[PDB]
Design a protein around this ligand. Sequence first.
Ligand SMILES: CCCC[C@H](N)P(=O)(O)O
Ligand SMILES: [Mn+2]
Ligand SMILES: [Mn+2]
Ligand code: NA
Length: 261
Amino acid sequence: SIKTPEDIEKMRVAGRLAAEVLEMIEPYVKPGVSTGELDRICNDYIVNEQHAVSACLGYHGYPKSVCISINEVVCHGIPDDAKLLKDGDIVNIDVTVIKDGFHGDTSKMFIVGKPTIMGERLCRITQESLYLALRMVKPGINLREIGAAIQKFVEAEGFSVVREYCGHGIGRGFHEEPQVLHYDSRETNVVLKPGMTFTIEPMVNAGKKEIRTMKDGWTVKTKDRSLSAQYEHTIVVTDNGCEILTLRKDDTIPAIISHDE
Ligand SMILES: CCCC[C@H](N)P(=O)(O)O
Ligand SMILES: [Mn+2]
Ligand SMILES: [Mn+2]
Ligand code: NA
């Protein structure tokens, strides 16, 4: 759908809160901490301080407040008090908050302790694939072109793109039309228009693109157990570009990307 200025302002607030959770949890992602603990810290912050609520909790039965995925886990990892972080781990924390009826969805990678060279490389390329997509967003561009650009870049840098999970429209609903694929698909044909709000959240594997879903029905892993990274931002298409609603202080791209001269 097409969001109104009123809707957009509310999404700015929800997006900002979601981003602030990631900025807050940052210093706690250390060797020795459990993902279950990281989840409690995030949830307490969201409920007690932001006076908001996690959109993940209860969604199709999801048991926790945030998704935390480690190394070969592609996405939707479930926080667990028994799972401790250790040196070298690459960790994605995916946050989705609901405030004033609107959603804000974002995630970023964190490397624990001493980084591994390929670990740093994978995360770097993944974030750049997101940035590349974001600098492309403007009315007139087709989602298929965006997905094609992401895939071309990722593959050009020696990695693979996960096909089964994608970005999505977002607003008063967690997942709304359209689907935002991170690769070139014949199924995709959507011309962007101002007012559309959606996410871009490429999942990149160091090895092959194939994945597998665990018995819990949530945890997704790379079929070859290679590392997988992901970054996500929620945006709104503007008259001549886009505006990132979940920008953080550490992002190396501005909130508003305009294509004017
Ligand atoms: C708890 C369900 C997972 C929802 C994730 N934020 P996404 O749909 O962006 O992977
Ligand atoms: Mn997400
Ligand atoms: Mn999402
Ligand atoms: Na991973």
